[PDB]
Amino acid sequence: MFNVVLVEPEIPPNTGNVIRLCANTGARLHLIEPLGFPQMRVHRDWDAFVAAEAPDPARMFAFTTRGSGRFHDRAFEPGDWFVFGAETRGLAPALVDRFAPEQRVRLPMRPGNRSLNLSNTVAVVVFEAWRQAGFEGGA
Amino acid sequence: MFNVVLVEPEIPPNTGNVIRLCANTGARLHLIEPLGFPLDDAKMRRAGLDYHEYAQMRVHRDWDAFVAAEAPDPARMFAFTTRGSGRFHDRAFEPGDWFVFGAETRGLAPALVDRFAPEQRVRLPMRPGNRSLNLSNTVAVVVFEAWRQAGFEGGA
Ligand SMILES: Nc1ncnc2c1ncn2[C@@H]1O[C@H](CSCC[C@H](N)C(=O)O)[C@@H](O)[C@H]1O
Ligand SMILES: [Cl-]
Ligand SMILES: [Cl-]
Numbered sequence: 428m429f430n431v432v433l434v435e436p437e438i439p440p441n442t443g444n445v446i447r448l449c450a451n452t453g454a455r456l457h458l459i460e461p462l463g464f465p466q467m468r469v470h471r472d473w474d475a476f477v478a479a480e481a482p483d484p485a486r487m488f489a490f491t492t493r494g495s496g497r498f499h500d501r502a503f504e505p506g507d508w509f510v511f512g513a514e515t516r517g518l519a520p521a522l523v524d525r526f527a528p529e530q531r532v533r534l535p536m537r538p539g540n541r542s543l544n545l546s547n548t549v550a551v552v553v554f555e556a557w558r559q560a561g562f563e564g565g566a
Numbered sequence: 567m568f569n570v571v572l573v574e575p576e577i578p579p580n581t582g583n584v585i586r587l588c589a590n591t592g593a594r595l596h597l598i599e600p601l602g603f604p605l606d607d608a609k610m611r612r613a614g615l616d617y618h619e620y621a622q623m624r625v626h627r628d629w630d631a632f633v634a635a636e637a638p639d640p641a642r643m644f645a646f647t648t649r650g651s652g653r654f655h656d657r658a659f660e661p662g663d664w665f666v667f668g669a670e671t672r673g674l675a676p677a678l679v680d681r682f683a684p685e686q687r688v689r690l691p692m693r694p695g696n697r698s699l700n701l702s703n704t705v706a707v708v709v710f711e712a713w714r715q716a717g718f719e720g721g722a
Contacts, residue, residue, distance in 0.1 A: 544706070
């Protein structure tokens with residue numbers, strides 16, 4: 428339905444939450460090693476992820492608080508790739524650089540230095556994408 | 567503007583996450599006792615939550631005191647349950663609405679669910695036969711969907 432990609436996740440409970448979200452929504456989960464702890468696929472690194480999956484870059488979105496891409500605008504489609512960063516530092520700047528600026532997407536928040544919980548961010552993005560697809564598969 | 571109501575929450579990290587989600591979204595948080603855990607300013611600070619992030623949170627002795635104290639519009643209060651509900655996303659939400667969630671393990675007590683008209687009963691869509699979502703994630707999805715319908719007013 429959709430692809431969730433967690434880059435170097437750190438905190439076990441967030442990934443547990445996301446596995447549960449994927450199961451409920453039909454999203455496929457991709458974890459990019461190294462992880463902070465010991466359908467789902469685990470990839471040695473980012474480069475291996477791209478070689479294995481060959482994502483269409485036009486349909487790849489990097490969620491980051493530093494993004495200028497607006498969440499509210501965005502049309503998501505089945506098969507898109509929703510990429511999320513680790514809890515402490517977020518996505519590495521050099522990885523965010525590979526996404527075109529409009530593909531770097533920020534979820535709105537009240538003013539100030541803030542970020543959403545990782546698993547919350549993933550659930551909002553997936554449910555909004557799922558809404559746009561009419562919740563196909565859902566009861 | 568939006569209100570989140572946790573009825574008898576059990577798992578402490580869920581409530582901690584919901585406090586932060588409310589600060590990030592500008593939602594008001596209400597808890598209804600009995601809680602599954604103590605609330606102490608030292609425990610909060612230890613969790614990494616700053617005083618002003620949770621100072622406006624309201625704790626209610628029980629449901630009837632909550633209603634008495636807040637006087638929520640029944641037509642604008644939504645209960646999260648499976649019994650007789652419709653899909654959450656079907657409903658049009660307004661600033662100031664109330665979203666009522668039960669314990670992640672228990673769900674809302676039938677006693678309470680029976681007080682809500684079917685129209686006000688809502689659930690998130692799920693693929694059949696799966697465990698429910700983490701409560702924190704459910705609240706996030708709820709608040710961000712209601713906020714989307716208001717055009718993310720006051721957010722950027
Ligand atoms: N408002 C928001 N918009 C888009 N993505 C967000 C978000 N809040 C959190 N995230 C996602 O959640 C991940 C972990 S939160 C990252 C926190 C980091 N210290 C920072 O200041 O950004 C991020 O890498 C990002 O994918
Ligand atoms: Cl959050
Ligand atoms: Cl709970």
